[PDB]
Amino acid sequence: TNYPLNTTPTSLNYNLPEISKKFYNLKNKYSRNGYGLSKTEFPSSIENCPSNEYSIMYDNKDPRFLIRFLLDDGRYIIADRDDGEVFDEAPTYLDNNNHPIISRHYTGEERQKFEQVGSGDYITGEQFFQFYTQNKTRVLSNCRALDSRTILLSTAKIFPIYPPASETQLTAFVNSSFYAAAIPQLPQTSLLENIPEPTSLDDSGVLPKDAVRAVKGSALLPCIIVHDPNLNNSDKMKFNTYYLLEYKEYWHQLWSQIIPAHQTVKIQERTGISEVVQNSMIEDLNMYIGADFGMYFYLRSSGFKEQITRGLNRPLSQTTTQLGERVEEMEYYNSNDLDVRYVKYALAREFTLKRVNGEIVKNWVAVDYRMAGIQSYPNAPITNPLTLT
Amino acid sequence: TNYPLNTTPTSLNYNLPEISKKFYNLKNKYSRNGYGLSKTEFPSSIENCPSNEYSIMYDNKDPRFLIRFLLDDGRYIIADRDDGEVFDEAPTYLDNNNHPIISRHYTGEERQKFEQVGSGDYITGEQFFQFYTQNKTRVLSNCRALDSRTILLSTAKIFPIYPPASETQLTAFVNSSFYAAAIPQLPQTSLLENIPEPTSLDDSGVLPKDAVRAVKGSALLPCIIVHDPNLNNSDKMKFNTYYLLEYKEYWHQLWSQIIPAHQTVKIQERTGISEVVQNSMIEDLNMYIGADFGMYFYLRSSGFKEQITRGLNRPLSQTTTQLGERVEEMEYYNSNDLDVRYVKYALAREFTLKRVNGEIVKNWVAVDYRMAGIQSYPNAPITNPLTLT
Amino acid sequence: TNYPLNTTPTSLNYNLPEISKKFYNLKNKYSRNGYGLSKTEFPSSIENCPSNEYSIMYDNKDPRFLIRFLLDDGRYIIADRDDGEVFDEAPTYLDNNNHPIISRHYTGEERQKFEQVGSGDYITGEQFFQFYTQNKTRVLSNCRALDSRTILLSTAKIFPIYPPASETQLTAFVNSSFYAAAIPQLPQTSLLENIPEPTSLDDSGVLPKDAVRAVKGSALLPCIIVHDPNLNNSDKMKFNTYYLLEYKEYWHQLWSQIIPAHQTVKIQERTGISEVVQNSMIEDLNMYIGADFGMYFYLRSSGFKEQITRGLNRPLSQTTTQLGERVEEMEYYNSNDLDVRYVKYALAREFTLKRVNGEIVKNWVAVDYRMAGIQSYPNAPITNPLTLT
Amino acid sequence: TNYPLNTTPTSLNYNLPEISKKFYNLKNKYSRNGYGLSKTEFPSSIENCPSNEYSIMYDNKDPRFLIRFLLDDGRYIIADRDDGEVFDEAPTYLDNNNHPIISRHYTGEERQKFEQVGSGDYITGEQFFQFYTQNKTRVLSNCRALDSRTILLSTAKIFPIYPPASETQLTAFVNSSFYAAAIPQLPQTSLLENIPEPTSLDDSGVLPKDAVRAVKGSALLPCIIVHDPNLNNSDKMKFNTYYLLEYKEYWHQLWSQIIPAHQTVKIQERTGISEVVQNSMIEDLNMYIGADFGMYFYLRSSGFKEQITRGLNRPLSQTTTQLGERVEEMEYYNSNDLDVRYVKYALAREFTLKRVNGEIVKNWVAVDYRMAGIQSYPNAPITNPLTLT
């Protein structure tokens, strides 16, 4: 036989473009003197092009290094290496009905999304790229100048590739020098064991802290969606440009007891997830587990929902209701004529956020009461099922 | 130093989902008796569910093996292993305002595009997927039955995950057995030499057949977009599920001559591309080179334009006009007082279609007259430039 | 620039042949009826070919699945999937000066090492392989038969490829069906931070449990060299065919204290490694840390020493003396006129043994007193160094 | 099912260490002023350390960039980037029974082989490596100096790691800056079709130029073993540091004819390989095909024989006799009562040498008459076999 006789693990994938894995210095393709996007504190040199501390500046010193995080629809969030803020088409107006591009914290709003279009010079054949907004009805452009300090804006004044128009020069970017993004290694998958079956009356089984996890999925989260206040902005973006979100399953013990012959016991079974754990996941990732056990995304992470759920191998939630905490008091009777070790597990769905360096930031676990079972020693067909109620 | 002192080649990427790389047997998740999509020649067993030879059938024998080719917008073309036809939402009506899904040759029309949505059972937690059309206003569904021979259709009768509705069962697919797609290996990139400079008066330089190609890009073309009449449907889909389209550049010699001291010569320079070569690329790939030297895609390949151009590293064309053939008669005068070997090259942009087995199906070359040069021995500053006109 | 402006992690490599990653059913190339190596409990069918419970049997039922672990010199240890024992050329004699091949626990002795040679049939061109011992002066061969139950032995009766000899048939193996080996994923490397410098007088710095590890190396250990009594033989070989040995470094705090102006303190500094930890590494891996901080290997792991040290990025030890434990009482005086927070770290060299499933079996740490430093707040040039003695 | 229902191609592997893939500047670990191995034309600054134009020099200018090609036994050939010559322990004597290390063309002799040993400073913990010859009875060492221009030699004066000896400093190398080796991409494997069967009486079948090759193996050949006089030394080493040797199989047509009912034909069948083709392979690669169809290696390539044959998937030859050319006149009779299209193929074993840029340098083909067949239309059981003789 050509393939193994046993199952083998799979590589988890989370493919990204090169521009989503590098912070590039973005230069103007036509500038004679090295001008490109900049984080200069000096003001605009040009009337009708005013700057302030929010402006995305254009200068031939103090360059920005910018990563393009890929959204599910192919647009990009353009994020800065040094302060972790993003470009944002501000709804205010400059002259001539243009909007300034500003630096702002990431919100996931439409105004922070940019479509990259690959184009070029019709005469020379040289390639460059541009950024558009509003379904290609606005283009990003320097304010007036190719070779003086100015600001970046978006304009609705767009020109066709032919006949070539001077103004298009102000929209033409090329990649220059770059820093690599820090990206976690994706773990390999692993198989989940069967729900653990006791081997003797003294086998108390496996506690959640000791249960072997099966790795089932993983996503690379842009750091702009992660709130990790243990780091500052610059360390997060430079050393943890993407965080790892692992999806793992394990059997989570509800309880384990010898139930003597003909005896009743009452046992609390706690499953689902607590509001405390759900509120933590909202705060850290803008995600929570829906009442259908799918993943629900608020606006900050929403733009990456399809990629993240594809990588985790868990579905998008179809309900806005949060999964709740189930706390149920269960009364069990062992009708057998022998003492029986009983143990109940439900499947835990564990999401773990990690830094590039492997540190665990947080885990959040949903105990899935729809996927549970009671195992025992001795067991069927020697004994009859434990009776509930 | 941590990185090499020389440049190194890069891997070309063309990432695809697993479902775009496998022909899967698609089974109904709830069927008790093994029913799924089928290529049975037997008719539908059910009134109000009529079948004919175009129907996509549902049966527990003669399964189809279906690949999902990924479109630029995340939708899929669903294509059959055995006959290379695709699923198509026919505009005709069954009862209850539903449309039949039929098998049809690939056109690239909207009616052949399907959105896959990952869902699951709200009670059991078991996962499955569905197919929607028309911006999630129709879902694909068996006609009436889970466990008898019937047809596949699309319906606008969709139900929410909660409360669970019986009818949703008819829409629920899972992957089963599969065959791997045949996929070409992507070549590694290589650097283009400088435009060749003669080393002596007898150096006649390099003819196009002998010029070293630099590999600059590559795309994997679904075979549904390739017309390769040397193969039948079944061989193309099973052994060449994707073709390779390489993008390579080389210097293409226009002419090489010793032009004696103080002598004039007249030389025809042929550049651009011929209509014959453009018509061939249209026929084989539904693509041509635009007058801006970008890539232009007709409807058959249009759905994959962004992925293909990203892989080739050539831009999308912004003009519908075809690149033409330039045939120019040039008159040159060597004003130097010595005999000078002159050679003129322009950059050739070569697209080569290959089978999985490495066979070359076709090459098409656009000679780019915007990127050309005349080199010589002896040369500047010893001689003055050749004068044109 | 063509390469990043920052350092990037590297993949750790630990390349192995395919036969070292699969347990293959080894069949005789010439047998007409499916005979190959077997774990049959039935006895040899042949006089002068006696079997007992140690014999490696040859039969057409109950096949063995055998992995070939690659030794530093290119020889192989041939190990069984089901019981984890290895083939061994027993020094006892059968008739005709031959030795029986037996199953035995792994020792790493010369008698358990086999040279695989790729050969073939001179007439037909068909390929097969053989196993030799004693620098190709003995070949492994069935005892007498191609197509009856017998034993495996080694013989000094070897024949040249030409003219073809009948007896060579008994030596000719081919690979058949197989199970994949379970192999851990190799971690990516990471950079070690500078020795931590306090930022205030109240910064007590980082305890060993909390120190970030830099991954610097890793080796895949054949499970035959690992003593992991938490598993039985069959689970170890099938689910942990190779263990992972990670090499990581971190800064290990000896102490942290404010030493007030003009005050003396006495502090115990514990470095090196304890005999208890060294004896554990000997028991589990047959390795210890030499007094030169290199790796020392006893016979069980010795055969893989070069591969293991190449993967860990630590050198082979040149001394048989074990690294000892240094327990030193240090007297420090702060001569500065201000209270100074002082902290001392030495570099820890941490070796961690993991299962395929990621569970940590053990860690062993050597605290390297040759690579240590005292940092402080405030620090040079504001203060003078802490004086020792 | 978990694996495909069809066969899938495999990656060919040819794993190499990092030092075999980079030309490193080798510096002395203890030098205060940047000294290391050098290609300086200036003479040795030191009495008793004479230099000439063959010496491997040691200086702090004009560094060498040296690749270490890995031999089957783990030793290295140390080769220069700029002239493609190798280090060689010359049998002449300096003072004190030492030998000079010289630069020499590659021969594959024992005097050009070096064992790299990873060591370090016993006091500081800093790592470095050394080079030994003659089974670790000589070490490479600077002649006398750490920080003046001198020569490289080998000495039998070796000191233990403990107690540390001054002289060991002269043997201690570290890697510095580097250039990446140019290395070909390894092709993916492909399956060989069945021997082609005609489909009609007019099907004349497939000529060798048109036969589809199955890729079955590949090796990366150090350029020191390849004679490629189309390039100079510097271009070969910098741009083709390794050549690719592909192993491919195809069906090579001996003849195709309609043999009419009851008619005889006489046909020349040419198989094996010509002396002309064997002499070419000897000249270019120092290899030929043995009479057993295995690979035979002369001294220049012998050191890499195991790696090369493992990569090609062809065995080492067990005979010194060259495969010859078989030229046989065959008389065939068609005893059937109908006209039959007959075609005879034998399996061709094709070895193709390629540059990094993909150019084909040469092919050599052995037509294997042991693996041949006559196919026909019509065929068995409709017709009787063609009778030979």
Give the 3-state DSSP-derived string for chain D, with helices as H, strands as E and coil as C. Answer: CCCCCCCCCCECCCCCCHHHCEEEEEEECCCCCCCEEECCCCCCCCCCCCCCCCECEEECCCECCEEEEECCCCCEEEEECCCCCEEEECCCCCHHHCEEEEEECCCCCHHHCEEEEEEECCCCCCEEEEEEECCCCEEEEECCCCCCCEEEEEECCCCCCCCCCHHHHHHCEEEEEEEECCCCCCCECCCCCCCCCCCCCCCCCCCCCCCCCEEEEEEEEEHHHCCCCCCCHHHHHHHCCEEEEEEEEEEEEEEEEEECCCCEEEEEEEEECCHHHHHHHHHHHCEEEECCCCEEECHHHHCCHHHHHHHHCCCECCCCCECCEEEEEEEEECCCCCCEEEEEEEEEEEEEEECCCCCEEEEEEEEEEEEEEEEEECCCCCCCCCEEC
The residues near B333 (Cβ < 8 Å, ≥ 6 apart) are B263, B264, B386, B387, B389
Report how far Cα B359 is from the mean position of its chain's Cα atoms.
17
Asked whether the beta carbons of C150 and C170 are under 8 A apart, the reply is no
Chains with 3 or more CB pairs closer than 8 angstroms to B? A, C, D
Question: The sheet that has C360-377: what strands, in order across it?
Answer: C214-222, C242-259, C340-354, C360-377, C264-272, C325-333, C387-388
Each domain of chain C, given as residue ranges in start order, spans 21-180, 181-389
Which amino acid, A113?
K
On whether any CB of chain A is under 8 Å from the CB of B316, the answer is: yes
Report the 10 Å Cβ neighbour count for C44. Answer: 22
On whether any CB of chain C is under 8 Å from the CB of D163, the answer is: no
Chains with 3 or more CB pairs closer than 8 angstroms to C? A, B, D
Query: Which 8-state DSSP code applies to residue C239?
Result: H
Compute the distance between CA of residue B183 and CA of residue D311 in angstroms, rounded to an integer: 23
Asked whether the beta carbons of D288 and D300 are under 8 A apart, the reply is no
On whether any CB of chain A is under 8 Å from the CB of D162, the answer is: no
Asked if C370 and D72 come within 8 Å (Cβ–Cβ), the reply is no
Rg (CA), chain B: 28
Asked whether the beta carbons of B310 and B70 are under 8 A apart, the reply is no
Q: Which of C1, C179, C357 sits opposite A4 (nearest CB)?
A: C179
D88, D90, D106: which is closest to D98 by C-alpha? D90
Compute the distance between CA of residue A343 and CA of residue A379 in angstroms, rounded to an integer: 11
Chains with 3 or more CB pairs closer than 8 angstroms to A? B, C, D
D185, A267, C157, A172: which is closest to B8 by C-alpha? D185
Strands (E), B209-324: 214-222, 242-259, 264-272, 287-289, 295-297
Asked if D8 and B180 come within 8 Å (Cβ–Cβ), the reply is yes
Compute the distance between CA of residue C226 and CA of residue B173 in angstroms, rounded to an integer: 45
On whether any CB of chain D is under 8 Å from the CB of B199, the answer is: no
Report the 10 Å Cβ neighbour count for C83. Answer: 15
Burial class (CB in 10 A: 0-12, 13-18, 19+), D97: exposed
Distance to chain A for B146, nearest Cα, Å: 24
Asked whether the beta carbons of A165 and A157 are under 8 A apart, the reply is no
- Residues of C within 8 A of D118 (CB-CB) are 309, 315-316
On whether any CB of chain C is under 8 Å from the CB of A279, the answer is: no
Report the 10 Å Cβ neighbour count for B186. Answer: 19
- Residues of A within 8 A of D3 (CB-CB) are 3-4
Asked if B7 and C2 come within 8 Å (Cβ–Cβ), the reply is yes
DSSP-derived 3-state class of residue C379: coil
Which tokens is B240 given? 């060449």
Q: Around D113, how many Cα atoms within 13 Å sit in the side-chain half-sphere?
A: 17
The residues pairing with A108 across neighbouring beta strands, listed in sequence order, are: none
Compute the distance between CA of residue B332 and CA of residue B315 in angstroms, rounded to an integer: 34
Compute the distance between CA of residue D139 and CA of residue D130 in angstroms, rounded to an integer: 7
On whether any CB of chain B is under 8 Å from the CB of A294, the answer is: yes
Q: What size, in residues, is chain B? A: 389
CA distances from D19 to B294, D129, D180 (A): 42, 12, 10
Nearest CA in chain A to D6: A2
- Residues of A within 8 A of C359 (CB-CB) are 212
Report the 10 Å Cβ neighbour count for B243. Answer: 24
Asked if C125 and D371 come within 8 Å (Cβ–Cβ), the reply is yes
- Select from D220, D357, D359 the residue whose CB has the most chain B CBs within 10 Å, as the one to mutate to test that interface: D357
Asked whether the beta carbons of A170 and A28 are under 8 A apart, the reply is yes
Asked whether the beta carbons of A23 and A84 are under 8 A apart, the reply is no
The residues pairing with C74 across neighbouring beta strands, listed in sequence order, are: none
Asked if B4 and C4 come within 8 Å (Cβ–Cβ), the reply is no
Distance to chain D for C161, nearest Cα, Å: 7
On whether any CB of chain C is under 8 Å from the CB of B135, the answer is: no
Contacts 24+ apart (CB under 8 A), A3-7: A3/D3, A3/D4, A4/C22, A4/C178, A4/C179, A4/C180, A4/D3, A5/C177, A5/C178, A5/C179, A6/C179, A6/C180, A6/C238, A7/A191, A7/D2
Distance to chain B for C11, nearest Cα, Å: 14
Asked whether the beta carbons of D272 and D324 are under 8 A apart, the reply is yes
D171, D183, D90: which is closest to D136 by C-alpha? D171
Which tokens is A7 given? 């199952």
- Residues of C within 8 A of B3 (CB-CB) are 3-4
Specify whether domain C21-180 bears CATH 1.20.210.10.
no
Asked whether the beta carbons of A151 and A105 are under 8 A apart, the reply is no
Compute the distance between CA of residue D117 and CA of residue D128 in angstroms, rounded to an integer: 9
The residues near D351 (Cβ < 8 Å, ≥ 6 apart) are D245, D246, D247, D281, D312, D363, D364, D365
The residues near D224 (Cβ < 8 Å, ≥ 6 apart) are D69, D77, D79, D84, D86, D106
Distance to chain D for B376, nearest Cα, Å: 22
User: What are the helix (H) ranges across chain A?
Assistant: 233-239, 275-285, 299-302, 305-312
Q: For chain A, how far is it from start to end, CA to CA, in angstroms? A: 52
Which tokens is D270 given? 């040419």
- Residues of B within 8 A of A318 (CB-CB) are 119, 160-162
The residues near A321 (Cβ < 8 Å, ≥ 6 apart) are A290, A291
Distance to chain A for D231, nearest Cα, Å: 33
Which tokens is C215 given? 């991954």
Report the 10 Å Cβ neighbour count for B358. Answer: 16
Indicate the pairing of strand D150-155 with strand B127-133: unpaired
Which tokens is B190 given? 């290589």
Cis before C381? omega within 30 = yes
Which tokens is B180 given? 């791997």
- Residues of D within 8 A of A7 (CB-CB) are 2
- Residues of D within 8 A of C291 (CB-CB) are 162
CA distances from B224 to B14, B112, B115, B360 (A): 17, 12, 18, 18
Asked if D4 and A3 come within 8 Å (Cβ–Cβ), the reply is yes
Compute the distance between CA of residue D212 and CA of residue D376 in angstroms, rounded to an integer: 20
Report the 10 Å Cβ neighbour count for B62. Answer: 12
Compute the distance between CA of residue B264 and CA of residue B251 in angstroms, rounded to an integer: 25
Asked if D185 and B190 come within 8 Å (Cβ–Cβ), the reply is no
Compute the distance between CA of residue D217 and CA of residue D312 in angstroms, rounded to an integer: 4
Which tokens is D52 given? 């000439």
Which tokens is B229 given? 């009449």
CA distances from C145 to B37, C31, C148, C153, C266 (A): 52, 9, 6, 12, 78
